[PDB]
Design a protein around this ligand. Structure first.
Ligand SMILES: Nc1ncnc2c1ncn2[C@@H]1O[C@H](C[C@@H](N)CC[C@H](N)C(=O)O)[C@@H](O)[C@H]1O
Lengths: 118, 249
């Protein structure tokens, strides 16, 4: 610590981030190293292929940063309802706020219905 | 650059998000109370929002980057020191010479490359490593799957008075020009792991591989794949988050 000055929430394609917006202005307004983030994000999400990656960039007062990539979103993982949530419910553990390993599938399958997926 | 604005948070607009990337968005950004989608061209979307028609601080504050025995210079720089100058026009193509991975590979080339060595630079981008290899008396081939970086690589070469071969493609395309004494590859851990057996096929017996673009925590994957491919560990180097792993076959 290391005072936090910003927490930037973005959603970027895996391994194909660029210094172009939103990354440019989103990190640039706080003086964070854009090229450093671009290189690091791309390597961290490299194997994921075409998956849409939500990312949280924490920017500090010394202009340095750290970031956390996400699960990612259910709306991507949905795209015909089969035994989808036998592993998706275990995927949404570090994304959903509910403090239970089991109580998640009872909400993902319902949210899948309106898309509309049968 | 265009921007499509939508009221609400990213989680709140979750179900309609894949449709924004179906349109051709390049990135989402949660702001004060909105979500900012960014498009190269504006296309009609039934989500109801607002369209708006709306790097140089880095480029003009750009200083020479030391990577002994090299100094990486922009075309508008000079240098008075004894370092070998590497003139690279900064662009969108990776290989500006400033990143940790590039600098690790430059230094590793100095430690490993023999004059007359046939060198493959896999994923050449700007051409920086192939150019450096030539500066060290190496006989370099730089290959890239992106044909757009190749004119930039050739232009950079002429800025340095060296002539590596540049080629579109990957390991396959390089095969008829090999086998090689040295492979240098600034890629990423998972690709190194998948390519390890073909790395061995690319090199002469006794040849070596210099692998970087590897996040510290992803290094075990490369170590495992390279040992599995029959490589012997030579040395490791690190800077910040990143590592370079050297191997001999
Ligand atoms: N499988 C592949 N075969 C050949 N080139 C690739 C492959 N995957 C990615 N690349 C290219 O490798 C480059 C990776 C760059 N980060 C490396 C640039 C430069 N060699 C440096 O060390 O700074 C990109 O220009 C990609 O287009």
């Amino acid at each position: 610590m290391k005072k936090v000055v910003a927490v930037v929430k973005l959603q970027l394609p895996a391994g194909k981030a660029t210094p172009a917006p939103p990354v440019g202005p989103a990190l640039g307004q706080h003086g964070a190293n854009i090229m450093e983030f671009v290189a690091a994000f791309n390597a961290a999400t490299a194997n994921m292929g075409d998956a849409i990656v939500p990312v949280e960039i924490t920017i500090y007062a010394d202009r340095s940063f750290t970031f956390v990539t996400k699960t990612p979103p259910a709306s991507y993982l949905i795209r015909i309802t089969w035994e989808q949530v036998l592993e998706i419910a275990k995927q949404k553990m570090p994304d959903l706020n509910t403090t239970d390993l089991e109580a998640a599938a009872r909400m993902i399958a319902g949210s899948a219905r309106s898309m509309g997926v049968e | 650059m265009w921007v499509y604005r939508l009221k609400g948070t990213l989680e709140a607009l979750d179900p309609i998000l894949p449709g924004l990337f179906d349109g051709g968005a390049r990135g989402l950004w949660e702001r004060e109370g909105e979500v900012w989608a960014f498009f190269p061209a504006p296309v009609d979307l039934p989500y109801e929002g607002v369209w708006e028609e709306v790097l140089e601080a880095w480029r003009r504050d750009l200083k020479p980057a030391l990577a002994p025995p090299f100094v990486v210079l922009a075309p508008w720089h000079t240098w008075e020191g004894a370092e070998i100058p590497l003139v690279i026009e900064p662009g969108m193509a990776f290989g500006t010479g400033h990143h940790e991975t590039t600098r690790l590979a430059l230094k590793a080339l100095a430690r490993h490359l023999r004059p007359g060595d046939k060198v493959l630079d896999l994923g050449t981008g700007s051409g920086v490593l192939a150019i450096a290899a030539e500066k060290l008396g190496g006989k370099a081939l730089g290959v890239d799957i992106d044909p757009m970086v190749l004119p930039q690589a050739e232009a950079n070469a002429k800025r340095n008075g060296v002539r590596p071969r540049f080629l579109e493609g990957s390991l396959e395309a390089a095969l008829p020009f090999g086998p090689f004494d040295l492979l240098v590859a600034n890629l990423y851990a998972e690709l190194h792991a998948a390519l390890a057996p073909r790395y061995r096929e690319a090199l002469v017996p006794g040849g070596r591989a210099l692998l970087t673009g590897i996040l510290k925590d992803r290094a075990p994957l490369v170590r495992e794949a390279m040992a599995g491919a029959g490589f012997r560990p030579l040395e490791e180097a690190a800077e910040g988050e990143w590592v370079l792993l050297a191997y001999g076959r």
